[PDB]
Design a protein around this ligand. Sequence first.
Ligand SMILES: Nc1ncnc2c1ncn2[C@@H]1O[C@H](COP(=O)(O)OP(=O)(O)OP(=O)(O)OP(=O)(O)OP(=O)(O)OC[C@H]2O[C@@H](n3cnc4c(N)ncnc43)[C@H](O)[C@@H]2O)[C@@H](O)[C@H]1O
Ligand SMILES: Nc1ncnc2c1ncn2[C@@H]1O[C@H](COP(=O)(O)OP(=O)(O)OP(=O)(O)OP(=O)(O)OP(=O)(O)OC[C@H]2O[C@@H](n3cnc4c(N)ncnc43)[C@H](O)[C@@H]2O)[C@@H](O)[C@H]1O
Ligand SMILES: [Zn+2]
Ligand SMILES: [Zn+2]
Ligand SMILES: [Zn+2]
Ligand SMILES: [Zn+2]
Ligand SMILES: [Zn+2]
Lengths: 195, 195
Amino acid sequence: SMEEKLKKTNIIFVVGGPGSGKGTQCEKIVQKYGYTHLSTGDLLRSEVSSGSARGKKLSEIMEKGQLVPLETVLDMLRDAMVAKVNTSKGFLIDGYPREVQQGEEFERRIGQPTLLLYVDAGPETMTQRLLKRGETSGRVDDNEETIKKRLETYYKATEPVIAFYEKRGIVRKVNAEGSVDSVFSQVCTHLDALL
Amino acid sequence: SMEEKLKKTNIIFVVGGPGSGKGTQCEKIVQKYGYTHLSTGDLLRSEVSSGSARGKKLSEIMEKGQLVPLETVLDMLRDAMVAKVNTSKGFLIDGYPREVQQGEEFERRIGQPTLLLYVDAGPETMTQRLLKRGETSGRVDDNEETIKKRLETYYKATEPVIAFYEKRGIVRKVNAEGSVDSVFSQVCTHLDALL
Ligand SMILES: Nc1ncnc2c1ncn2[C@@H]1O[C@H](COP(=O)(O)OP(=O)(O)OP(=O)(O)OP(=O)(O)OP(=O)(O)OC[C@H]2O[C@@H](n3cnc4c(N)ncnc43)[C@H](O)[C@@H]2O)[C@@H](O)[C@H]1O
Ligand SMILES: Nc1ncnc2c1ncn2[C@@H]1O[C@H](COP(=O)(O)OP(=O)(O)OP(=O)(O)OP(=O)(O)OP(=O)(O)OC[C@H]2O[C@@H](n3cnc4c(N)ncnc43)[C@H](O)[C@@H]2O)[C@@H](O)[C@H]1O
Ligand SMILES: [Zn+2]
Ligand SMILES: [Zn+2]
Ligand SMILES: [Zn+2]
Ligand SMILES: [Zn+2]
Ligand SMILES: [Zn+2]
């Protein structure tokens, strides 16, 4: 069954603040280790891109830097994992879970994480990186006021996810400040010790 | 993509009361036409037989003749479709949807049905068939008190699904009383007109 396949595949939660460098690092991991990268923000923006009514309501939530309903995001995430599991070498789950309840529901419908990679950047680092992206990019959640909301939401809801999984011994932290290459070296040190 | 694939495959919804003969007709369709038969009841009973805590809870609900939660049954159902869509000639969905809400979420995450085959029997015929099976079988829900509850749930929640899909012109009724062969001859007339 697809659910049995899901339980025997490695699941890595990638957790960290807005603009910490999660996507950037995931694409490096994908290139080196061959894992399957799923970002809930990407999947959400793909629905927004349809131009649908449902999409507009989701976009209005993301432009306030708030969390979308748990069901909506977990349904999308599970569907996308079931699509790829049969050929996957492992999953990188970027930006899910964002609250403890999101982690509990994931384990109930899919299964427990094998590892949690914690990309730890400071709030001024994060703000500057997203302000710089907002100059060039088309993302509609990189304005200064919405970066503030995204930071608040992360510290309120998501930082507790780290302490939750910390209890099980599966967290591996990396200093996310400094060069893309310096951060990836730390990422590889953690992954190589397990694989 | 998997999403595109699921939107392209033929989906036939098979709807009818408890003991109306859905499974029996579905196997004859598989034998003649080579479709893929998925019974949500079978799926759920497989989970029960695993011995899981989830299975214990599902059994208690099936023993009251009531509907199990949507996300649990739809996870199982969509998973089974994804596992077979690359090779399937078409799907027979037996016993889902059981309420209008179930139909709407299926359409949004999978695709819209091509046909609804309505297996139409009277309550006395249904009750007599299930008591006869109850003599010999191992099913936990074929006792006389639970048969009664399954009927109530069908008339309250499920028979409205029919009126809902009739508005799209896709409903095809068969008189489900009489021999297995008489019923199947009606079924073939409907399927031949489509195929
Ligand atoms: N589970 C969920 N539940 C409910 N709602 C959900 C949800 N998931 C998503 N949502 C909703 O969708 C919204 C968007 O979610 P999401 O898309 O997940 O946003 P985020 O994780 O908060 O932030 P980013 O994707 O912007 O940052 P990142 O950490 O991926 O960094 P990146 O590599 O891009 O890097 C950022 C920039 O920095 C640069 N950079 C990266 N590393 C470095 C470096 N070392 N030095 C200099 N620059 C760097 C990059 O080039 C780039 O320009 C949420 O706010 C919410 O509304
Ligand atoms: N979507 C969902 N959402 C929430 N919960 C869900 C759900 N789906 C399932 N559930 C849960 O799971 C439970 C079980 O659901 P489910 O297994 O789907 O039960 P059902 O559809 O109510 O009833 P049966 O499967 O017993 O009848 P059938 O119509 O397939 O007829 P059959 O061919 O077996 O034949 C019956 C008997 O009569 C015989 N027979 C058949 N045709 C004839 C004939 N023409 N003449 C004489 N005998 C015949 C057969 O040999 C057999 O012995 C539900 O009650 C619910 O709790
Ligand atoms: Zn990202
Ligand atoms: Zn990616
Ligand atoms: Zn749902
Ligand atoms: Zn059946
Ligand atoms: Zn079958």
